[PDB]
Amino acid sequence: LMAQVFFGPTYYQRLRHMVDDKIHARARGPVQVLTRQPVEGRSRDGGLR
Amino acid sequence: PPQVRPSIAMDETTQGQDDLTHKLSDILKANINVQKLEMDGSPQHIIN
RNA sequence: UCGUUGUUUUUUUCUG
């Protein structure tokens, strides 16, 4: 490579925010009884606001 | 109707009364109570 | 034998 590269070890730590814990999609599903609207929360197949 | 004040379900079988249900039932009790003062001793202070 | 339903209420610590 025409230029050089900084290079070395460094202390890296993983973090709790894994992607699979955030991915989510809703085509249809449960709706709030009161308003007949999609429920809230990823864990319940919520709907985006 | 019930739709406006649906019955919540605290845990499966046991369904709690929406606040509106309690309030309406209390107003109904009070209204009956006023209807019952006139037929007996109503010393203008129980009425008030 | 298709059908087939799953709580609220607050508070909290977090993410951009």
From TrEMBL, chain A:
Signal peptide: none annotated. It comes from the Eukaryota. It is found in: Nucleus. Belongs to the RNA polymerase beta chain family. DNA-dependent RNA polymerase catalyzes the transcription of DNA into RNA using the four ribonucleoside triphosphates as substrates. Component of the RNA polymerase II (Pol II) complex consisting of 12 subunits. This is DNA-directed RNA polymerase subunit beta. It comes from Komagataella phaffii (strain GS115 / ATCC 20864). The chain holds residues 1081 to 1129 of 1227 of the full protein.
TrEMBL record, chain B:
It is found in: Nucleus. Transmembrane segments: none annotated. It comes from the Eukaryota. Belongs to the RNA polymerase beta' chain family. DNA-dependent RNA polymerase catalyzes the transcription of DNA into RNA using the four ribonucleoside triphosphates as substrates. This is DNA-directed RNA polymerase subunit. The lineage of its organism: Eukaryota, Fungi, Dikarya, Ascomycota, Saccharomycotina. The chain holds residues 244 to 291 of 1743 of the full protein.
